[PDB]
Write an enzyme that holds these catalytic residues in place. Structure first.
Site, PDB file in Angstrom:
ATOM      1  N   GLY A  14       0.733  -1.222  -0.350  1.00 20.57           N
ATOM      2  CA  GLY A  14      -0.050   0.109   0.030  1.00 20.57           C
ATOM      3  C   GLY A  14       0.880   1.235  -0.056  1.00 20.57           C
ATOM      4  O   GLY A  14       0.231   2.402  -0.093  1.00 20.57           O
ATOM      5  N   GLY A  16       3.518   1.691  -2.093  1.00 20.93           N
ATOM      6  CA  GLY A  16       4.071   1.957  -3.356  1.00 20.93           C
ATOM      7  C   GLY A  16       5.351   0.782  -3.410  1.00 20.93           C
ATOM      8  O   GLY A  16       4.997  -0.339  -2.954  1.00 20.93           O
ATOM      9  N   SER A  17       6.354   1.145  -4.114  1.00 22.86           N
ATOM     10  CA  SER A  17       7.392   0.339  -4.521  1.00 22.86           C
ATOM     11  C   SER A  17       8.647   0.776  -4.114  1.00 22.86           C
ATOM     12  O   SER A  17       9.066   1.871  -4.261  1.00 22.86           O
ATOM     13  CB  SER A  17       7.258   0.107  -5.900  1.00 22.86           C
ATOM     14  OG  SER A  17       6.271  -0.621  -6.356  1.00 22.86           O
ATOM     15  N   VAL A  18       9.241   0.158  -3.315  1.00 24.44           N
ATOM     16  CA  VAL A  18      10.859   0.463  -2.745  1.00 24.44           C
ATOM     17  C   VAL A  18      11.888   0.032  -3.294  1.00 24.44           C
ATOM     18  O   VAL A  18      11.828  -1.541  -3.463  1.00 24.44           O
ATOM     19  CB  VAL A  18      10.944   0.359  -0.947  1.00 24.44           C
ATOM     20  CG1 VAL A  18      12.089   1.307  -0.444  1.00 24.44           C
ATOM     21  CG2 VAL A  18       9.690   0.759  -0.709  1.00 24.44           C
ATOM     22  N   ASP A  90      13.936  -6.204   8.112  1.00 21.55           N
ATOM     23  CA  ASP A  90      12.820  -5.702   9.013  1.00 21.55           C
ATOM     24  C   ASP A  90      12.257  -6.489   9.982  1.00 21.55           C
ATOM     25  O   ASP A  90      12.727  -7.652  10.009  1.00 21.55           O
ATOM     26  CB  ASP A  90      11.618  -5.198   7.982  1.00 21.55           C
ATOM     27  CG  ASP A  90      10.781  -6.664   7.675  1.00 21.55           C
ATOM     28  OD1 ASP A  90      10.348  -7.509   8.331  1.00 21.55           O
ATOM     29  OD2 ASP A  90      10.403  -6.524   6.342  1.00 21.55           O
ATOM     30  N   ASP A 129       1.275   3.866  12.314  1.00 25.22           N
ATOM     31  CA  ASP A 129       1.422   2.499  11.835  1.00 25.22           C
ATOM     32  C   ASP A 129       2.521   1.866  12.502  1.00 25.22           C
ATOM     33  O   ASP A 129       3.073   1.012  11.710  1.00 25.22           O
ATOM     34  CB  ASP A 129       1.255   2.508  10.462  1.00 25.22           C
ATOM     35  CG  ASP A 129       1.054   1.098   9.511  1.00 25.22           C
ATOM     36  OD1 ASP A 129       0.354   0.360  10.445  1.00 25.22           O
ATOM     37  OD2 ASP A 129       1.344   0.768   8.456  1.00 25.22           O
TER      38      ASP A 129
HETATM   39  O1  LIG Z   1      11.305   3.498   3.843  1.00 26.27           O
HETATM   40  C1  LIG Z   1      10.783   2.335   3.271  1.00 26.27           C
HETATM   41  C2  LIG Z   1       9.464   2.145   3.303  1.00 26.27           C
HETATM   42  C3  LIG Z   1       8.906   1.204   3.238  1.00 26.27           C
HETATM   43  C4  LIG Z   1       7.372   1.274   3.307  1.00 26.27           C
HETATM   44  C5  LIG Z   1       7.298   2.691   3.397  1.00 26.27           C
HETATM   45  O2  LIG Z   1       8.534   3.183   3.159  1.00 26.27           O
HETATM   46  C6  LIG Z   1      11.562   1.191   3.284  1.00 26.27           C
HETATM   47  C7  LIG Z   1      11.196   0.009   2.808  1.00 26.27           C
HETATM   48  N1  LIG Z   1      12.007  -0.878   2.834  1.00 26.27           N
HETATM   49  C8  LIG Z   1      13.321   0.048   3.155  1.00 26.27           C
HETATM   50  C9  LIG Z   1      14.360  -0.489   3.142  1.00 26.27           C
HETATM   51  C10 LIG Z   1      15.525   0.472   3.754  1.00 26.27           C
HETATM   52  C11 LIG Z   1      15.115   2.006   3.838  1.00 26.27           C
HETATM   53  C12 LIG Z   1      13.890   2.241   3.624  1.00 26.27           C
HETATM   54  C13 LIG Z   1      12.812   1.122   3.508  1.00 26.27           C
END
Ligand SMILES: O=C(c1ccco1)c1c[nH]c2ccccc12
EC number: 2.7.11.1
Length: 267
Positions: A14, A16-18, A90, A129
Site C-alpha cells: 500500500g 508503493g514500491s521501494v 525488517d 502504523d
Molecule cells: O522506507 C521504506 C518504506 C517502506 C514502506 C514505506 O516506506 C523502506 C522500505 N524498505 C526499506 C529499506 C531501507 C530503507 C527504507 C525502506
C-alpha cells in the site's frame, strides 16, 4: 534519476514500491520509493503527499527514523529518496526467522522504538502504523529505524476520526468508535508490538479479541514484561502509560546500547 543508481525492488504494498539504490554523487545507499499520485490518500504543503510533510518534520538531525534525503515529483507519481542502512532486515522478517525474542533483545528493540516515536512526537508527527514491518534493523549497528509515514498525521491533541493503519494494531476505541487520540493509540500499538516481539506473533487477530482486550501468553514471558504489555493494552485510553511511564517501567531498566545489542544478538 541520473543522480541515483536503481537496484532490486525491496517490496511493494500500500506504500508503493521501494527499490534499493545508490546515490551516484557519493555512493550512499538509498531506498527509492515511488507512489502513484492516484494512490495517495492525504496531502499537505506546493502540494506534496502528507508523508513528505511528515518526513521533513522528523528528518532533521539524527534519529531512529529513516530520513528523507530528497524527493521528486513526477507527472503521475512522487519519488522519495530515503536512507538505507546496509545490511538491514525488517522486524517482521526477523521475528519470522528467529521466533519469539529473548527479553533482553526485545527490551533493546522496544526502547529504540520508544525513542523514535518520542522524537516523531516532539517533531509534531504521529506515525499511526507502528508494527514489526515498519521497523528496520540495521544489523551491524543494532539500530532500529522507523519507516512508512504513509498513514501518519500531524500530532494534535483533539480526537482522530480517520485511520488507515494496520487493524490488528489499532486500539479498541478505533474498532468500536472510529475515534482515538494520538498518543494513547500509539501506546496501544506499542503494546501489540511488544507482545509480538516476546511471543513471536501478535496477540489478537479478530475485532472481538481486540475489544475484549484479554491477553494470553503462548511463550514464557517474565511477569514485568506481561505487566508492561497489559498496561499498554489497557482498554481505556487514559489507563495507558505515557512514553515516560513506559520508559520508567521496571522491565525497561538497564537497556543494552544498540551496538551491544548487535554484538550479543545480531552477530
Ligand atoms: O522506507 C521504506 C518504506 C517502506 C514502506 C514505506 O516506506 C523502506 C522500505 N524498505 C526499506 C529499506 C531501507 C530503507 C527504507 C525502506
Amino acid at each position: 534519476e541520473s543522480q541515483y543508481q536503481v537496484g532490486p525492488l525491496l517490496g511493494s504494498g500500500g506504500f508503493g514500491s521501494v527499490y534499493s539504490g545508490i546515490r551516484v554523487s557519493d555512493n550512499l545507499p538509498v531506498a527509492i520509493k515511488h507512489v502513484e499520485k492516484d494512490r495517495i490518500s492525504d496531502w499537505g504543503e506546493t502540494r506534496v503527499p502528507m508523508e513528505v510533510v511528515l518526513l521533513k518534520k522528523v528528518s532533521s538531525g539524527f534519529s531512529g527514523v529513516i530520513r528523507l534525503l530528497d524527493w521528486f515529483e513526477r507527472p503521475d507519481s512522487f519519488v522519495l529518496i530515503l536512507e538505507r542502512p546496509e545490511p538491514v532486515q525488517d522486524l517482521f522478517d526477523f521475528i519470522t526467522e528467529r521466533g519469539a525474542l529473548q527479553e533482553e533483545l526485545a527490551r533493546s528493540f522496544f526502547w529504540q522504538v520508544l525513542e523514535a516515536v518520542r522524537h516523531c512526537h516532539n517533531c509534531g508527527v504521529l506515525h499511526r502504523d507502528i508494527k514489526d514491518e515498519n521497523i528496520l534493523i540495521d544489523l551491524n549497528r543494532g539500530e532500529l529505524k522507523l519507516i512508512d509515514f504513509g498513514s501518519g498525521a500531524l500530532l494534535k491533541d483533539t480526537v482522530y476520526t480517520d485511520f488507515d493503519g494496520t487493524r490488528v494494531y489499532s486500539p479498541p476505541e478505533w474498532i468500536r468508535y472510529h475515534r482515538y487520540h494520538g498518543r494513547s493509540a500509539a501506546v496501544w500499538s506499542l503494546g501489540i508490538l511488544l507482545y509480538d516481539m516476546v511471543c513471536g506473533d501478535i496477540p489478537f487477530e479478530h475485532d472481538e479479541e481486540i475489544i475484549r482486550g484479554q491477553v494470553f501468553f503462548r511463550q514464557r514471558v517474565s511477569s514485568e514484561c506481561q505487566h508492561l504489555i497489559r498496561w499498554c493494552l489497557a482498554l481505556r485510553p487514559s489507563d495507558r502509560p505515557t512514553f515516560e511511564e513506559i520508559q520508567n517501567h521496571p522491565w525497561m531498566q538497564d537497556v543494552l546500547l544498540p551496538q551491544e545489542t548487535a554484538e550479543i544478538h545480531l552477530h
